[PDB]
Design a protein around this ligand. Structure first.
Ligand code: HEM
Ligand code: HEM
Ligand SMILES: CNCc1ccc(-c2cncc(CCc3cc(C)cc(N)n3)c2)cc1
Ligand SMILES: CNCc1ccc(-c2cncc(CCc3cc(C)cc(N)n3)c2)cc1
Ligand SMILES: C[C@H](O)[C@H](O)[C@H]1CNc2nc(N)[nH]c(=O)c2N1
Ligand SMILES: C[C@H](O)[C@H](O)[C@H]1CNc2nc(N)[nH]c(=O)c2N1
Ligand SMILES: [Zn+2]
Lengths: 409, 415
């Protein structure tokens, strides 16, 4: 059936037809909704229909469905799955597939940009040194001296599952975290385990509060190897406040490049287990989650001190006041340093515009309200009031197991 | 369906196990292929004899389980008596004990409510003997007075007679017992609460003389036994109101804001053992953000961010200055301060969400789960600095329950 989504602020109703194209499960049933669950629950035989479906939609998008090129491609893929139990994507198909995995990513508020994605083909890579080279070039290109550019680098697909390419870092650029003798934690507490895996592999930690982790790279199922990203490639921003001159003395910094490296890109039944991709930050990612999550850098109490706020009762909203100032600082700092960043008002506004675009030209836009609504000031952004439908379209970005749980050394 | 479902808290790493979902009784709107978790709402006839039997037995079984008398002589007798009632009259009547149990559990089961730690402390007023709109008015006035308690709010529900053939419904036409009027002007501006223009126009048609002010309490529009609804003014002394001021900004009181103390939902349907109570107004107390963020700062509501931003002398040219967010916090500080100062019960969103987590954990432990709607439970400001943001939740529908129902002006057959 045709499903309707309403905006309760504008009373705009949109009609979703696109959902009729899904086949992958959401996790929900008619009786139980798993909308807030973060991670809900090949062979030649399985591979061809998937390949067939992807090839069909590719030639549908370039308006040549049933064409000779289309027919020959379908035949081509058949013989190759037949004789090798896999197949290789054409360049045009790789690029199409990567852009549409982004386009279909229901948890991403940045998708108005989806067709502007620089795709780096790294499928000829064979070694960790090779991966390091490709990743360094990605970082340099994407960073672009502050004028950030969306990019994805795609390493060889899975074959037998014993020769996977993996970036072991969850993101390309992150700060180390150290368990202190006295029980506390220096740096990013979320990364303590990974940091210690790096130390155990020979990494000499500076034991500072913002130490860029090394890359840990696995090529063709081999033991991973360590590499330091050259520092001039790692763009960082000191955080200061436009009114509070004491804010710089907190000693805060962050990296300019958000780059997810632990996901799996699926295209036409092929699995790309190493596909680091990057964009630019929304301010709240740093200001709210990275800095103020209790399990992260956790700086609210400190900032509240310097603001001289009364912190005895929660109903003074002292946390809320500190939160807003921290996020003002982050936006101000990046902007002052000419580093691309978007505030959550601008981003969610762009997303509503994007949704409208997709409903008109595509018949829908899969979207995960739980992830799209920002972690602060939710209802004064327009996505809070926007009904969204969530469903799974392929090509897609999927989660995969942590490498350190499925790798025989 | 799997017998055990796990939910994780991503801040504390606490994992909880849900078995209660197995008792799910009707549908969420989601399917295997689409999730409607952010959809707000995903024939004038009634339940037949055959439909009512299993629904009644299900509820009676559950009641006698709760009082540790499952399988008792009293249990088997009640089943038999209920079965006879449905067989001869094609409906049945709940005992007072069962009515109270059912109401408390409809609240316990309400997946969109963050205040459920309080669910067993609910004063139930049995108004099933009511026959006229004047009588409904008396019952509602007593509810308001009891629940308000001079500012020491007490949660309460008043239950009017159940549905019979569908042509004799009791309805409160008001969506909430206490709301402010909205007035659309010829030039397109709105006075008062813009959300309430439609209902306000209905009241005016029915004979209400409008003060045409910014905070005019609407009259009750009460429908008894399927008759045309009738208008009543709640005695102003029963409507507790709080003027909004700010502990630091002396100019904040100059905005002339106030709000009412008692949040009371009156447009929902209470379903117990297959019986349908189409008029069941219930009330609790406010969480500050309901007023401070939604009523005051929604663009479609009172929309005061701009005016407050100006008085705060904020740079309002770039959104990236977060002037809106800064004003939002100050407005919500003002609301909590004004309620506390006047000793009217209110809870801040930090306290409420912390209590809810403790509640949820206790429910998983004693009941095997706690259905919760994340989209509704997480507050409309500062989401991730509240613990519920990081809590995975399962949403499913248990009965007894509160359900939505059509607006009565859309369905009513005028006499
Ligand atoms: C260009 C600017 C972009 C912006 C402003 C943006 C914004 C965001 C934000 C705020 C999130 C939530 C992140 C979190 O809470 O962990 C997110 C998630 C996500 N983004 Fe985007 N993004 C951008 C680019 C991209 C690109 C280039 C891709 C892929 C080619 C992408 C794919 C995804 C995916 C798959 C997620 C979900 C991640 C997960 O499930 O953990 N995004 N995005
Ligand atoms: C006692 C203090 C209570 C608190 C602090 C509280 C808190 C809340 C809040 C903040 C909401 C969201 C309302 C909205 O955004 O429109 C809500 C919804 C709800 N509450 Fe509670 N509540 C309380 C009492 C009650 C009682 C006494 C009942 C019923 C007996 C109840 C049943 C419900 C229901 C059914 C909803 C969903 C309303 C809808 O779908 O529009 N609550 N509650
Ligand atoms: C439970 N949460 C654990 C967690 C903690 C941190 C991160 C994370 C760390 N560093 C960077 C990110 C970037 C997310 C992102 C990706 C992209 C492409 C754009 C963007 N704005 N933001 C995410 C992810 C997950
Ligand atoms: C689409 N949203 C429209 C809408 C607008 C206003 C209201 C509303 C108006 N006045 C009062 C409320 C109270 C909701 C509530 C009920 C209860 C029992 C407790 C509580 N804290 N809050 C809700 C509900 C819905
Ligand atoms: C579209 C979305 O479902 C809608 O705006 C919801 C979001 N969450 C909410 N949460 C609460 N408590 N109250 C609401 O009215 C809403 N509105
Ligand atoms: C339990 C819940 O699903 C989890 O905390 C989610 C909520 N929404 C989120 N939204 C974004 N953008 N990122 C997140 O990590 C989360 N975490
Ligand atoms: Zn769902």
């Amino acid at each position: 059936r045709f499903l309707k989504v309403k905006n309760w602020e504008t009373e705009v109703v949109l009609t979703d037809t696109l959902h009729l194209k899904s086949t992958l499960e959401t996790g929900c049933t008619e009786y139980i909704c798993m909308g807030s669950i973060m991670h809900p629950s090949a062979t030649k035989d399985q591979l061809f229909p998937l390949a067939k479906e992807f090839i069909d939609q590719y030639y549908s998008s370039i308006k040549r469905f049933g064409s000779k090129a289309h027919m020959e491609r379908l035949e081509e893929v058949n013989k190759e799955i037949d004789t090798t139990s896999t197949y290789q994507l054409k360049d045009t198909e790789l690029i199409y597939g990567a852009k549409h995995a982004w386009r279909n990513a229901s948890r991403c508020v940045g998708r108005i940009q989806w067709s502007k994605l620089q795709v780096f083909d790294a499928r000829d890579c064979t070694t960790a040194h090779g991966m390091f080279n490709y990743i360094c070039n990605h970082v340099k290109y994407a960073t672009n001296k502050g004028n950030l550019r969306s990019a994805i680098t795609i390493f060889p697909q899975r074959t037998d599952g014993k020769h996977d390419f993996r970036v072991w870092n969850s993101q390309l650029i992150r700060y180390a975290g150290y368990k202190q003798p006295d029980g506390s934690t220096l740096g990013d507490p979320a990364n303590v385990q990974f940091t210690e895996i790096c130390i155990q592999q020979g990494w000499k930690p500076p034991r500072g509060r913002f130490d860029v982790l090394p890359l840990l790279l696995q090529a063709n199922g081999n033991d991973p190897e360590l590499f330091q990203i050259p520092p001039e490639l790692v763009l960082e921003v000191p955080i200061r406040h436009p009114k509070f001159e004491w804010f710089k003395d907190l000693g805060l910094k962050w990296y300019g490049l958000p780059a997810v490296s632990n996901m799996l890109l699926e295209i036409g039944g092929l699995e790309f287990s190493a596909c680091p991709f990057s964009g630019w930050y929304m301010g709240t990612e740093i200001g709210v989650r990275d800095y103020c999550d209790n399990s992260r850098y956790n700086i609210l109490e400190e900032v509240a001190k310097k603001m001289n706020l009364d912190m005895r009762k929660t109903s003074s909203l002292w946390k809320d006041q500190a939160l807003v100032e921290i996020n003002i600082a982050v936006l101000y700092s990046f902007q002052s340093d000419k580093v691309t960043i978007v505030d959550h008002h601008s981003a969610t506004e762009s997303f509503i515009k994007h949704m409208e675009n997709e409903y008109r030209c595509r018949g829908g836009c899969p979207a995960d309200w739980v992830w799209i609504v920002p972690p602060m000031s939710g209802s004064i952004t327009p996505v809070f009031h926007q009904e969204m439908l969530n469903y799974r379209l392929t090509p897609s970005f999927e989660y995969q197991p942590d490498p350190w749980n499925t790798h025989v050394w």
